[PDB]
């Protein structure tokens, strides 16, 4: 899990 904040992220 976990939120990805950045380019080309989930």
């Amino acid at each position, epitope marked *: 899990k976990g*939120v990805r904040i950045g*380019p080309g992220q989930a």
Partner: antibody
Amino acid sequence: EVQLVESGGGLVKPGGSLRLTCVASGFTFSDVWLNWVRQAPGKGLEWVGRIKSRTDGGTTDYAASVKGRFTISRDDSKNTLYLQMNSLKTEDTAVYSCTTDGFIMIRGVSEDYYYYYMDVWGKGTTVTVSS
Amino acid sequence: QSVLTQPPSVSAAPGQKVTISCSGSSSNIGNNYVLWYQQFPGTAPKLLIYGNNKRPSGIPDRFSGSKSGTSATLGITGLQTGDEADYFCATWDSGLSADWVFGGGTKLTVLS
């Protein structure tokens, strides 16, 4: 002792090719995404492209200004990142640096948030495309 | 010519405050999160702000960031001669290649 060291820069004729190398050390290479960025004299930084980690597919993305001419690849067993440049143009002249995508993790009351950013930066290698 | 536009330079005396603007579009600053970097000569860029306004551990609250519409701002109060350096904003593009994009950079001079 976290670092990136690039080499391979040099003088090349327009239409020529050149391959740059970036050696990593001090951290688990295979676990991170890497970028190639460049900066021409007296100008702003420009992202060249990225290559994802094996776990995320190991795929590549390229800036519109270089796609089709530049190829990025990695060799996790050698902690090495490569940038193969073909059909070089004078406007490709610049200092080329490799960087990793790192992150700041925040533990939320529910989910963990990962904010990515260019973390480690090499000192760069200079590429001059001119006749 | 930089994707994100920043004033070339800014200055103020020690103890004063300054703001450094970063102008972009909907496709970069508008849709995504802003980062700010501090860079000294011959040294790698250092993360000052991430997520528009978050400070990494080690960065004192004199440094602050904010984002509004298609622009972002870096504020620095209580100027220290040690702050004289280059500052640049960064975020990513919403395009097909999701490019990291950068501001041209602003040189902060702490009047000495």
